[PDB]
Amino acid sequence: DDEEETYRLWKIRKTIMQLCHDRGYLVTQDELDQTLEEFKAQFGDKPSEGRPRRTDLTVLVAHNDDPTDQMFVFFPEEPKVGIKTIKVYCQRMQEENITRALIVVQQGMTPSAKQSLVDMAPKYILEQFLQQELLINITEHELVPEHVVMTKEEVTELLARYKLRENQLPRIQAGDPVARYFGIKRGQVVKIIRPSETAGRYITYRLVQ
Amino acid sequence: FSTRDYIMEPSIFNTLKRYFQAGGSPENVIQLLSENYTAVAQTVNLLAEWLIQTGVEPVQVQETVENHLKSLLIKHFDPRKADSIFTEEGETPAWLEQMIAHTTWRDLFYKLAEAHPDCLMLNFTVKLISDAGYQGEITSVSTACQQLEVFSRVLRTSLATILDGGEENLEKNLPEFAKMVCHGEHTYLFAQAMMSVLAQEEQGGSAVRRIAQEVQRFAQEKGHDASQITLALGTAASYPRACQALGAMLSKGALNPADITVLFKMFTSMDPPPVELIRVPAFLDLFMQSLFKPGARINQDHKHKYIHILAYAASVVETWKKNKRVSINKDELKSTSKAVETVHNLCCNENASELVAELSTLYQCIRFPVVAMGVLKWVDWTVSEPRYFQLQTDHTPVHLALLDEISTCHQLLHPQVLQLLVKLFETEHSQLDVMEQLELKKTLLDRMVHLLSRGYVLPVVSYIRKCLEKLDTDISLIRYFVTEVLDVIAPPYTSDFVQLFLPILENDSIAGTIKTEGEHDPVTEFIAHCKSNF
Amino acid sequence: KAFEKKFRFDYTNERALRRTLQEDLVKDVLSNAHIQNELEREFERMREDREVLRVIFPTGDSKVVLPCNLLRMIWNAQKIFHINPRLPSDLHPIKVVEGVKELSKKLVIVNGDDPLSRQAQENATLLFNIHLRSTLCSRRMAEEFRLSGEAFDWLLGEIESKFNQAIAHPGEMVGALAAQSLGEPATQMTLNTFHYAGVSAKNVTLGVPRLKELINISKKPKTPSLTVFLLGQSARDAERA
Amino acid sequence: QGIEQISKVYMHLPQTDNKKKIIITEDGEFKALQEWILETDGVSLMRVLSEKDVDPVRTTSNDIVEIFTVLGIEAVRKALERELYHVISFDGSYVN
Amino acid sequence: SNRPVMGIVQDTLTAVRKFTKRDVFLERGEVMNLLMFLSTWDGKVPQPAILKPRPLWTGKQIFSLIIPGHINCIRTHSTHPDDEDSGPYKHISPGDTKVVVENGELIMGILCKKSLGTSAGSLVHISYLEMGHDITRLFYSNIQ
Amino acid sequence: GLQDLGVANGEDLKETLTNCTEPLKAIEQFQTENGVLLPSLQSALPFLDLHGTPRLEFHQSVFDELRDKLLERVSAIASEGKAEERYKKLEDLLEKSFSLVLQPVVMCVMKHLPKVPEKKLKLVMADKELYRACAVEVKRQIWQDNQALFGDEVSPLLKQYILEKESALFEVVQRLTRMVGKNVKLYDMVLQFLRTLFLRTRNVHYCTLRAELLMSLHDLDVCHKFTWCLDACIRERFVDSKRARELQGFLDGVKKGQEQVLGDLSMILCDPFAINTLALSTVRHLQELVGQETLPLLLLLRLLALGQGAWDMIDSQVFKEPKMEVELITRFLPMLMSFLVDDYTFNPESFTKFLQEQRMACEVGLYYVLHINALLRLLPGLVETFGDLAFGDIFLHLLTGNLALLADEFALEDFCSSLFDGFFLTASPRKENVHRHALRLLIHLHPRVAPSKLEALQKALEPTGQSGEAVKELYSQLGE
């Protein structure tokens, strides 16, 4: 349905602003929360065979500080993205000075593309997602406790105070949905604040492995 | 000879007295005279009005706020220690001015604060209320009606309002109309004394007697034991034995075969007491409690006596020519006795195939109003029992069809039928499946639709409106009720009905109501009629 | 409004102050506004704690497990000192407030002056401190309990000692204890605990089988069920449901 | 119509107090608002949430692996706590 | 489950209930025999609740000797109708269905499992909490 | 006091009531009255409050004025500065100023006083603005203090900068307060004042101006934005390379203009934190080039940009400075010699002297980085070059390096540093003498220099005629 598609795209964009803002990229409140009718007026309400369609609403956002690093998203028209298309996206970024970008695929994306992204990760980091997984925020869920990335300066004296090495810390897998949402790389620390029925608030510390 | 003051000119009256004869060391007098060190605060307050002129609200709201602040300050610094002396010494310039200008709530608040002190102030307030064209519209307090004039005037106004309103007013102002009369039993007896005289006359005596009925009903649960007093007011006091027996009966609040035997003996005689003694609703209610209860079986030794007593109470007539009865009828009490006995045996047998089989004869018996509302009460007691719904074919169609028959055969029973049905609908019955409960509520709404069809329409629609507004039940029930209602209504449409039914119609997913009507538009026609009417 | 009326300890009403506290106490309280300011500060902190508790317990359940039973100790102390709360109290609210603050500093869970250690300390006893502050609020303290100052400080000492005892000792083999104390109730439980119902109810299949399939996380469980909530008027309406 | 690996679905109003939603009235009291809820026999999460009118906050499953695949590890730890507590205290036996 | 487990065996439970019935009356010789076995006993007989016409003690008096130290507790009997507390007489139970102990003395209430056994917050639990486990041991022994 | 219509009427009534009869009742009636106040309430007040003070009415009026200010804010938010609401607020403020000499008037002006035609007249009337100058952020804050308050703040800013420099030898709130009255004209005036202060200080004010601009951009910011972002990236990453590349690209993609590029370069260069960051980046680039063995190349571009920024302050309307590619090889030659010496140890002097004689911020930074057989030979050459340079910033960097060496705790290096610090204290001002005394406080860990160090400090206390030398000598004597 055309209305179903436009609604889905509106939700996708909404989740994307929420993701970026949580990640730490400056975004204006208007985009952070805008009405479905507002987006429909913006884009035509006819994604199917209409002036709105994929790659039209791709947005570029810079970090809150140090505007050198900026990130934008790719919206392949085809369901299963092509390796040639990802290479074209890479070249588009090459024209840009920013090495960070995201991709949203309607369908599963090729394992060859997976390997390609892994190979070109070091020079520039490109991350992919899927419609259904991004269709609803995960952080919103009550079951999910509060998550915060950590920094080197804080991790250092944290380890010093607790007289333990990073390995001893309880671990979390890198490819988990939460670590993917936060774009956390290996060897990075995340603190979790949770409501405990028996002590009110509990703090836990985790390492992305 | 001081000339030391910035805004103390207002207190110049006391300043002159403290200065002309200051003498000694007038340090305190000088301090009082120069106490208003601020600027002309009265002028500042006046200019506050000018500022509000250009402000958001250049209206009398500021004046009302200032008056409220002054009243609150007076209440806070009320001279309760010497309030009586202050009110009763002069009483000339303060009470008169307050009644003339600030009589809105100042006097009422002062009276209601304690009401013990300031006897002169209370008397002045009562006099002002009496002088006011609107009888004591300010002094509406349950503990402030301890004065003959104020209480009688307020009671007269309340009675006039109730009579002007009518049946629709029988429920809203009655509780607050009774809260003061029942506050003191001396006041209650005085009201009953005047009210019996009012009822003596033929015209309006029925209404006055009815008002007495609901008033004594309220007093009963309020805690009054004035059954003997009511009997004294009634003609039953003419017979000391009858009055004593009936007073004991009412005080016990049950039925005693030993005393009812005496009542039967003195009844069905050549000179029966004036039926007004047995026409009191309270004794009939005691009869209802004792007789038609699903349980509580009686020894039945005097079963015929109870049946005959009920038939005599609800059937016989008399012609009070100059307060003298010379023409009475007793040809219908026999049929009444037969029907009531049949219904009593139906209640006693406590069984369902035979109940359905005799249902046809019960329909004939319903034509007696007493039998109909006895069936109503027994059905209420049976249904209200928790877990009464365990086996159902059409959600207990028997009892609900009995209610429909009662409503059709007797229009005056509609308020009580609605009360029972709405109580049942409000009640949530657990131990049942959700779908079953939903269907049960739909069945209840079917009886709502029947009551509406029987002309008891405005209260039904009003209750539906109220239930939608507060404690929102599932929208499905409201939709279903509206769909059924639209079927039974055809033009013409009363304007008041259209107004009552309108707001629920144009909200809460209107389009969902129309699914496959096709032949006749359910809500489109009503909308067109409403547009034409308004 | 009820919390306000129950914990404000308003001082404007002179008669209530006379009934509760002595003449010297009421006169000093009315004279010193700073005491009133601190009382207002305590009330605001209690309001914030009330909001925090309405956050932490979404359920409307007030049943919680705490290392101390303040009401029982208050009861014991009252009859120990023969308070006879009919008479007005003889202690000022300032001692109550300072003593509760001092106790809040006395009880320790996380040691160290490190900011990370500091955050952890108050987080650990966050709930217990809220409970003790709510119970020992000056309003209830002076009104419903009416302890003397000696009873008050003795009670504070008792709380200190009891919370000292409640500390979990180091070196206790606690993982084994926890798992094994899970075992005994499992033994008590039986697969027949469920007597079924007229409605299928999704066949929860609670009991030892459920615990089994949970302990060894199973890819395919017997009755994988999903609970679903609707948003608004769609849920309100059965038809939309 | 519908999704796969999902058989007949039940609907009911939660009698139990914990399940039914609670609203903080302006006066401060919690009020328990009974409301329709659904139970599906064949669990397929992240596809129910994709649909319309589905609450993403209150939804929870009874399995473990499915929620693990979609909500990290803290989510499953908490949900496992919830379920195990439910089972062990169904009989009224309280465990610390 | 942070509860007491030693509880009270079935037989002594029924015996203590029938003993602490609200109307139990006992003779001088029987009381003088019973008090012997209380290990923690001070050695001074308590005043009877009834003196004239005859000296007649009460099992609650006897049990107050058993209860050690000075403890305060409230518990609801198993047969306690809840509406009683809602209505009047909430401090004088017609059925003595409110368990009330003050300063190591049983004031009014029939002891049952809900006030003695493994029920959480029970008299045994509070005794252990307040006094020494040795005190609680002597308490159990004397009860039995 | 204030004499509005009502004030003048009250004054006239008071003057006329001093004589000519004027009985009490007539005077009370003719003085003034409260239209809102009811006669019944007025009559009852004497019998209850015993001539109660009208201060309750004044408090109620103050509360009503606060509510009116809130209503004006609500109207400006819903009506978006509605013309009628603005006119009513202006009329009310004028009336309040005329009547009371004015807390409600000041509050109303602050809440809503934009584009007020009578705002200039009101400000002129409140020329003193003892409290109003700060209370009226709309006018006093918005260009009110530009004429004199801006200069006063600049003087306090200079004092704060001097105090910070003195403390380092041994702010944000003010900038936020200044920027609170943020408008187009306010920003232009602030920029002009900052440029004037930087010109007067000869570079000192440039760092403060750049920091203030960066803070304003970061918090409620709104080529300036690009410059602020580049500066923030450089500050966040001392050795960052992507940020440096982005900044270089932005600078290259800057069209030639009248004083714009000059101001950007001056702001970049005149920043002690910025200078330190540039020096650290250059040192890191040189180390990377040495490791890669690819000596000559973004390091050359970075060095050229740093030199242009440093030389921009010489004169206005400047484009850039010569790259000096040929001289780059000679400059890097000492680094290659030092690296070769270090490699030989783990397995010159003339150039250092020439560099020290030549004035080069890059040379000073390289010497500081180096301080932070072949190595021994290079060290004397570095010392000679630093002595030849003899700059104040070079002395500060040498003090930092001496602190680092003291942390390293080198015995022979300790004696060499003691001699160098003595020479630097003798040559430099009281600040240099105090720094040398502080270093010597922990210096002389060996007993063979401790008495000598004490004697040298005692001699320098007298030799340093400035009070700083005497203070340092007294502190050293007290310590030991």
Numbering used by the authors:
A (entry chain 4): 2 to 210
B (entry chain g): 51 to 401, 404 to 586
C (entry chain 1): 914 to 1154
D (entry chain 1): 1299 to 1394
E (entry chain 1): 530 to 673
F (entry chain f): 4 to 104, 109 to 177, 199 to 250, 259 to 332, 338 to 388, 408 to 432, 439 to 546
Paper text:
To investigate the mechanistic implications of INTAC in promoter-proximal pausing, the INTAC-PEC complex was assembled using purified human INTAC, NELF, DSIF, S. scrofa Pol II, and a DNA–RNA scaffold. The cryo-EM map was refined to 4.2 Å resolution and the maps of subcomplexes were improved to near-atomic (3.5–3.8 Å) resolution by focused refinement. Structural comparison shows that the phosphatase and endonuclease modules of INTAC are more separated in INTAC-PEC to fit the binding of PEC. A previously undetected tail module extends out of the bottom of the backbone module and folds back to bind Pol II. The PEC complex sits above the main body of INTAC through interface-I/-II/-V and is further stabilized by two INTAC protrusions on opposite sides at interface-III/-IV. Cryo-EM map reveals four putative Pol II CTD segments, indicative of a potential CTD-binding path toward the active center of PP2A-C for dephosphorylation. The result agrees with previous study showing that Integrator binds both Pol IInonphos and Pol IIphos. The above structural and biochemical results suggest that multiple CTD-binding sites on INTAC may facilitate anchoring CTD repeats and recruiting nearby phosphorylated CTD to PP2A-C for persistent dephosphorylation. At the interface-V, the SPT5 KOWx-4 domain contacts the INTS11 metallo-β-lactamase domain, which bridges the RNA exit tunnel of Pol II and RNA entry tunnel of INTS11. Superposition of INTS11 metallo-β-lactamase domain shows that the association of RNA-bound PEC induces a rotation of INTS11 β-CASP domain by ~15°C and an opening of the substrate-binding tunnel by ~6 Å, permitting the entry of the RNA for cleavage. Thus, the nucleotide above INTS11 active site in the INTAC-PEC structure might be derived from nucleotide −23, because the following nucleotides (−22 to −1) would not extend to this position. The above structural and biochemical results suggest that INTAC-PEC paves an RNA path from Pol II active site to the catalytic site of INTS11 to permit cleavage of nascent RNA into a product about 23-nt or 24-nt.
